[model samples]
Target chain A: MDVEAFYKISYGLYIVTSESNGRKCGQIANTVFQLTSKPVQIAVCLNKENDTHNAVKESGAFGVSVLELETPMEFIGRFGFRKSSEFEKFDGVEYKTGKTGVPLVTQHAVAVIEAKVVKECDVGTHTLFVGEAVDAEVLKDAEVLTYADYHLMKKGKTPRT
Target chain B: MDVEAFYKISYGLYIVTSESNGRKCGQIANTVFQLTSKPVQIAVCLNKENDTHNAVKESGAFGVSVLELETPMEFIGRFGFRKSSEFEKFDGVEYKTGKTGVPLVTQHAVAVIEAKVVKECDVGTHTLFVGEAVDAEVLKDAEVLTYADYHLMKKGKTPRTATVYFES
Candidate 1:
């Protein structure tokens, strides 16, 4: 099998946020997608073992910050490829609470979306959370980063372990 | 929220095929994506309730046919939105069985990928099957169909029953 060919597929980077017990928590995710249009819904897949998963389930809401091309690797590593439970992910980060009380990073974001969970499917290791978008706004005019650019240009690696 | 805005997102349509118990089955899907590069791993989200899902689970192999825009909507409807158990979807279709014994739709497919399942994550109503591409072949030179173009020009609507669909 030519495993290298799969890396040719395109993707994007983003920060996903949710509140838990009055505390905010988040993680870097690349699996967000527009699931439906009828009710303005979106879906994000997260590992069931991730802390952010429990946070979203507790708060019933979450936020997404679409990262830009110029976003620093250090900034992305803080949330993109690392776990929040091990690090103070939001420390010194420029962000604000959305209507849903979810933290949204604005420093290197081009757009922000806040959503409330409508349904969740437990897929063994991961859970596909479908939510209805409650609010959204454009934050900057920067070029949105594509997954291809992150890998080929910046030389990023997947944090599957 | 403007539901129509989803039409702006980019996507590709594909035909997912599998063989189980000596029976061939296939379905149309748009949730296929490449997940890794070093190993050429790909992922496709299939509704667990679909017949093709069972086929893939039993055989542990499947085929992916990248569809083109030039393909007729009736053909897309036949496999994309329609259930296979209701009709003979491949009765008049031209196809070939791959090394995995999965049917590869040849008529309007630009490329074909034969894969072996490596891992599976059972999401509600659907299963995200991750596979390694065992073999691939380019069949024709044609523009790949994007979900955006299907909605804007082809006027395609995803059925609510699809795993991708959800009510707000």
Candidate 2:
């Protein structure tokens, strides 16, 4: 079985953020989806080993920043490949504290969604975090980026957190 | 809150198929994701009104056909806009029965995944079905057809479930 086949499933890049004990943490993720409409809910999957997972668990809330194609690689690397445990990811970054107390990034973002985790499930190496969207807004008019674009256009520079 | 913001979320187009008793059903779906790596789990959402929902629920299994961009719109409309409950979606389509006894669409598919439903969620207008993939195979070397491409290239004719329907 060629597991690479799984790579064909497309997704949009996003920064899933959370804060706990005054520490802000987040990571680049592609597995974000709208699960339902009424009582608006979105599902996000985070690897079990990610620091952002613990932050979301402790805070009970999370934020999603829909990234655009023009986002800088430096910004993406900070939230993705960089270790948030030691470095402040929000340092010098333009953002605002969401109603849920999570940091919603403003730069290079087309939209934002803040939610409180209402459902959680352990799925092997990952956790499926379901959130009830409390707030959402359009930030900019821009072209959205997909996983394919990251691979084809950016190549080795893109990091999959 | 401009619900249009949700449009930025990207996804690939797929055909989800299943069999119930003796009936075969399938539909076009854009909401599918790999929930986990180990055990190779997958999650798919289907509108409650879709015939494929009952087939997945009754059979406890389903198949996903990852579509390529080159696939004809006529083929997509067949499984997407046309109701499988009333029409024979596979009447002349090329497909094979999967390990789970669901029909795996072969035509225009880049890959196929078969799984048994292990978990289910009751979303307002849809059902989120989680499955443990037992079989998967790549069929072609092709560019995937994304939901964005579907709208940009083929405008005026995309089906939206009541759950995803936004008053634009």
Candidate 3:
């Protein structure tokens, strides 16, 4: 099979943040989707090795900040390409802890979703965290940056974990 | 947390089919997404325990049939609610195996995508299968069924295997 062909599919990039034991952590993620309506829920797949994973596990909550086109590459790198363990990832980023104590990334976020974990599954190297939507707020009206737009327009690469 | 607020989000539902050991298997899925455009990649997340998971694993290929809004709940339940092992799910369904020997559901599919598995990531109970689009044909121009539409309009229930399946 052609491995390169799989890179042509569209995706959306976002910054996911969470707080655990008073430590704020965030990571760049591309997989966030609403899973239910009656009892609002959303699911996000996080690599097991990510610090944000530990945070979400400890806090039982997370915040998804949808990025906009104008979001700086440096900002993306801060949350997307870089690891929190390697550096103080949230050092100067503007944020606030939501109702769930998960950090809400405010700087370049188009929207914010705060969720409380209700169910989880361990899929090898990653964990799919299914959360109930506790809160959500639109930060801006700017167009949400899709994974396709991030690659074609910003020429961004998928971050290596 | 007002859980009812998630109804505003957008999504699409599809029927994913595959052939394994000369048998056809399929399931209703909502986690299909376009990954890249250069080599034409798409991703589908399937529950690890589902029969379609084994089918795709054995065949290394699959067919994605984009379902339209007009598709009846009975058809959705045939694949979405019922287990394939207990019934001949594809008994009355019109389908044909493609180049990769994966079953393609043509009767209610508006578009058919024949895919070859390129990469897979196991996340909890689900496996994220990334596939390279080898062949595609638009069967008709119809309104693609969104997951939200399936619930709100069709009054369908979300399957437990689904990524969004959550309890109140």
Candidate 4:
């Protein structure tokens, strides 16, 4: 099997944020996508080791911020390359608290969606949190970023963690 | 809720195919993505009403053909707009049967991944099939299609059955 074939699957970058017991965490994610329209739900997959993953599991909620095409690599690295346990990702970041209390990143974000977990699936290395949208809005009109564009234009690399 | 906010989430287009008891079906899907790399798993979400969904459930296997960026709208419509039970989607389409017996669409496909379902999750209207890849190959080097590009470049619209459809 050519593992390179899996790389062809397209995705968009996102900042998945959540809060747990007064502690907040956020991480760069590429697996966030709308899963249903009737109930307005979305699915976000995060590594089991990610601090943001634990936060979402404990809080039963999540925030997805759609990054614009122009978002800098350093901005993504801030969340992707570092551990949320040691790094305060929200510090110096412009964001707003969603109805569910998850911090929604606003800098370089074109849209935001907040949700409460309706179902949880354990898919080996990651946890797929299927959430029903409680609130969502268009922050600004802009071209959203794609994982392919990030690799091709920004020359971004996936973090080793 | 603006509802349009859901449209910002990105995705790739794919032709998800499966075979069950000599019956085969394929359909256009935009909700397929890699879930993990260690064991090599991919997840494809299909509407419960889709014939392909039933095929995947019964066969416990599936094939994912990554559509190239240049794939025409008519080709997508052949699987997207029509029902698989009503049409032989692979009638004249060039495809290759994978190790799992699922037909992988080749024309306009840049890559293909065949898998056996290891887990299934029901998400309301859709069933998320998480499969362990048994066979995968890069058919050709090409830019894969994006849902955003399909709408902007090809003037495409999400089918009513799609997870992202918002009554537009």
lDDT of each: 0.71, 0.84, 0.72, 0.86
Determine which window of 10 residues in candidate 1 chain A has minimal summed lDDT. Answer: A1-10
lDDT of 2 at A82: 76
Candidate 4 wrong stretches, greater than 4 Å: A154-161, B82-87, B156-168
Tell me how candidate 2 scores on lDDT.
0.84
Tens digit of lDDT per residue, candidate 4, span A1-161?
99999889989999999999888799999999887778888999999999999999999999999998778788989988998779888898899999999998999899999999999999999999999999999998877777876766544343210
Query: RMSD in angstroms, candidate 3?
Result: 9.3
* Ranked by TM-score, top first: 4, 2, 1, 3
Q: C-alpha displacement of B128 in model 1, angstroms? A: 7.9
Across B39-141, the per-residue lDDT of candidate 1 in tens digits comes to 5656777877788888898999988887776778888877765455534778788789878788877878877788899877654567678777888777776
lDDT of 3 at A115: 90
| Quality of candidate 2 docking, DockQ | 0.40
Candidate 2 on A1-161: residue-level lDDT in tens? 56877888889999999998988998999999987887788889998898899899888999999998767778888888976797888888889989989999888889999999987876778888888998899998777767666665455443222
Look at candidate 2 and give me any clashing residue pairs: none
Each candidate's DockQ? 0.14, 0.40, 0.11, 0.47
Clashing pairs in 4: none
What is the C-alpha lDDT profile of model 4 across B8-108, one tens digit per residue?
88899999999988977888999999999889999999899988899999999999999997788888888875454534576778888887899888899
Ranking by lDDT: 4, 2, 3, 1
lDDT of 4 at A11: 91
Off by over 4 Å in 1: A156-161, B2-30, B34-62, B66-101, B105-168
lDDT of 1: 0.71
Q: Per model, how many backbone clashes are there?
A: 7, 0, 20, 0
